Write a protein that binds this ligand. Sequence first.
Ligand code: SF4
Ligand code: SF4
Length: 593
Amino acid sequence: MVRKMRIAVIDYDKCNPDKCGHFLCERVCPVNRMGGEAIIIDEENYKPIIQEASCTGCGICVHKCPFNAISIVNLPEQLDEDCVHRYGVNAFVLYRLPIVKDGMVVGIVGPNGTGKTTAVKILAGQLIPNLCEDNDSWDNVIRAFRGNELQNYFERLKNGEIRPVVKPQYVDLLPKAVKGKVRELLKKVDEVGKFEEVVKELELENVLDRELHQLSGGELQRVAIAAALLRKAHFYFFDEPSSYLDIRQRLKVARVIRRLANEGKAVLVVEHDLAVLDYLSDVIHVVYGEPGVYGIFSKPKGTRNGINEFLQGYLKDENVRFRPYEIRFTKLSERVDVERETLVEYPRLVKDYGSFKLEVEPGEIRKGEVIGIVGPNGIGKTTFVKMLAGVEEPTEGKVEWDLTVAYKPQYIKAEYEGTVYELLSKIDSSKLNSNFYKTELLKPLGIIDLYDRNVEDLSGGELQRVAIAATLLRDADIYLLDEPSAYLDVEQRLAVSRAIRHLMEKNEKTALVVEHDVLMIDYVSDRLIVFEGEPGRHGRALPPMGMREGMNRFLASVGITFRRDPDSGRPRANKEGSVKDREQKARGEYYYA
Ligand code: SF4
Ligand code: SF4
């Protein structure tokens, strides 16, 4: 086998055409000698340029450079030969692997279906690498990764003195597979003798009484986090633990997972929220490719640089573009925030089931804006949303008016016979066929390619995108999405953000997006509803307020302050106990866009 790209980098800060004659390059260059364009002259910025499309990689120019402003490398037997696994010809292929490490938290960021999960099975002893050949042994794996830390992994893995435990990419499998209580389960799975510490730090002592099927999202997720650590294993691989956790939970779970590094145990993590990712990890991997054709894991990076580079879409270590535009964000000074017309107003409501109490203070709904809902789970974010939605009748007050409400529920389960196209089509055929919904909603969330399978025959992340798109293609005055964040990746999360923002702004309509992922809030929100009280008991919904004034108000009850990163612009979470943490909290401004 073979395969090879040439990559040329010239440290211009070291080049000086006038000192080496006249671009010693083009002169000494064999290809240019025979009438070729390996090295071209930028007779303006006065620099030399190597057109890697030519350069034989002979390296003559490199040896000649009177300084050493030239490097030419052949990505041979390293990027093409590395090839790890092929599922048979005309089928998915993996290149490279994430490099897990002891005593450290190895991060992963990169869109779904790029064989994140392919690598897990590989590492779990349950799939032998063929190295895109025909192999069915460990030994060729151990050799191929010679010069690297993963050889040592495959040697232990085969002796079988390590076995990694894996928190699966979809959960909601344990309730329909394991019956009885969270109390029970957590005794059973116990083998680590750390039962006390776990259940307490992740605050599942109230959550023991309920049965698995009676859990809400945040709780079910965390109970999996618990049961994975109580199984005995050195290596713990968490695939998407950000699903359905609220803002308060996800920051607290991050601390729990981070404390593992100190115990010297190896954590491998997928996260799709940059603030949570920054905080946990110590290494970071970027994974690039178009889903379902190939995936390649990049070289290990230090968390901060790795994230910067993801945002830029350009790899300077690997020389790969993988997205033709940059990840970007919206402050509050990059907008027009001007007042708009009142759609409706709601008085004081108060709903008591008699197993939770909510009071909603008097509030205004404006037209043409996007209101983010924030707070910890079971604080009746959902109780409010459901009162306008019509599935719950307020005990007192009125919200149920002649606005039509479009409602995306918290769980997703399908009950629909027929295709993705049937399901959408009966709502508004018309919308499907117009160019806007095609630029902003349907096309970048993959739905054009999804019309051929049934709704029941769609998987969690595709089906999520399908629910979301469905709710926004309903004909309504006001759009209600309860927690769409679940099972979306970074790119998806962002695409849904740009779609919500454009569609709502253009037709001047209201939407409520209950939200907990920092980035979506950071882009989309015009106004905020902060929830407080003590969850599972009482909640007090405070009236709508400005985006900044809201995230300020709320962040102060979490102890956790947010900056603006200076490298390429993203929400920077600041470590509890830091300079910035201390300066923000002292000065009553607990947040910056
Ligand atoms: S070799 Fe490339 S870098 Fe060294 S001087 Fe000539 S042009 Fe500038
Ligand atoms: S061989 Fe080395 S120098 Fe000659 S072209 Fe290819 S890269 Fe540039």
